[PDB]
Every structure is written in C-alpha cells, then in structure tokens.
Amino acid sequence: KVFGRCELAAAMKRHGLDNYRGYSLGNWVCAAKFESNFNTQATNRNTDGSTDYGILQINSRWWCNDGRTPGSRNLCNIPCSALLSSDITASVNCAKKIVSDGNGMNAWVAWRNRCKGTDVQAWIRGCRL
Ligand SMILES: NC(=[NH2+])NCCC[C@H](N)C(=O)O
Ligand SMILES: NC(=[NH2+])NCCC[C@H](N)C(=O)O
Ligand SMILES: [Cl-]
Ligand SMILES: [Cl-]
Ligand SMILES: [Cl-]
Ligand SMILES: [Cl-]
C-alpha cells in the first residue's frame, strides 16, 4: 500500500506514534517519506547483506527475521514480511522498540540526514488529525 501523506499521519496517530518518545507526528511522517516514499512494500538490500523492510525501512540485522541475515537478531519477534503489510501495526510496534533503544530517531539515517532539525510540522500540515 502507498499511503497518502495525511492518511499515514492519521494511521500513525491511531497506533500511538504521535509524540512517542517525544517525537512529534511530523518526524515520523518525514522519516517514512524518505525511507519508503510511504510505500509499505518497500525493500532495500544493505551492503552487509541485511535488508530494510516497509514504511520505516526496519533492518533484518537487528529487528526482524528474514532467514537470510547471518548472525542477526529478531528483536521485534516478527518475520520481516509482516513489515510489508498494508496494516502498519507491526511496523509501528517495531519502530517503538527501535526508538526506545538509546539513539532515538537517529537510528534512521534518513531521518537524521533529511528530517532532523527541519520544519517537520509541514508534513502534517492541513491534515484532519
Ligand atoms: N536501531 C538500530 N538499528 N540501531 C543500530 C544498532 C543496534 C543496537 N546496537 C541494538 O540495540 O540492536
Ligand atoms: N526536497 C525535498 N525532499 N523536500 C521535502 C520537503 C516537503 C515539505 N516539508 C512539504 O511537505 O511540503
Ligand atoms: Cl508527500
Ligand atoms: Cl537470518
Ligand atoms: Cl519468522
Ligand atoms: Cl531522544
């Protein structure tokens, strides 16, 4: 599923991401924009052989099981495929665990490089939330 901008903001809010660990909804929408262009089915292989999955490009190295990332963990206790569903529940629950992990949203390199410090409120502007 390719979400609309306000559509995703709404879904993220419903699943409790808005201001989770102090990160406003706009941060999460901006992160999803540059990670996946709002596409739940996005996948990208990393140089190390792990793969990033879903709207927030969650990595098999630590967070999900894909059966093909040697030495990896599955800290969200899910198959990586659950992160590609049109229902964003698994991605949000896993993102909550990731952002609690110590480095906040810097865990997402695209957020650090393209969203951090910017006017992230623009991402939810005009949305009936
Ligand atoms: N959120 C991340 N993927 N961070 C990268 C390092 C992972 C971190 N050492 C951990 O607790 O698994
Ligand atoms: N070149 C870019 N990546 N621009 C993204 C900024 C989008 C802007 N915050 C908006 O939603 O209207
Ligand atoms: Cl957009
Ligand atoms: Cl594996
Ligand atoms: Cl599995
Ligand atoms: Cl933080």
Curated annotation (Swiss-Prot):
GO molecular function, one term: lysozyme activity
SUPFAM superfamilies noted in UniProt: Lysozyme-like (SSF53955)
EC number(s) recorded for this UniProt protein: 3.2.1.17
Pfam families: Lys
Tissues in which the UniProt entry reports expression: In the egg white and polymorphonuclear leukocytes.
InterPro entries reported in the protein's UniProt record: Glyco_hydro_22, Glyco_hydro_22_CS, Glyco_hydro_22_lys, Lysozyme-like_dom_sf
Localization in the cell: Secreted
PROSITE patterns attached to this UniProt entry: GLYCOSYL_HYDROL_F22_1, GLYCOSYL_HYDROL_F22_2
The protein's role, per its UniProt record: Lysozymes have primarily a bacteriolytic function; those in tissues and body fluids are associated with the monocyte-macrophage system and enhance the activity of immunoagents. Has bacteriolytic activity against M.luteus.
Additional information: Lysozyme C is capable of both hydrolysis and transglycosylation; it also shows a slight esterase activity. It acts rapidly on both peptide-substituted and unsubstituted peptidoglycan, and slowly on chitin oligosaccharides.
Subunit structure: Monomer.
Name of the protein in question: Lysozyme C
Organism: Gallus gallus (Chicken)
Species classification: Eukaryota, Metazoa, Chordata, Craniata, Vertebrata
Gene: LYZ
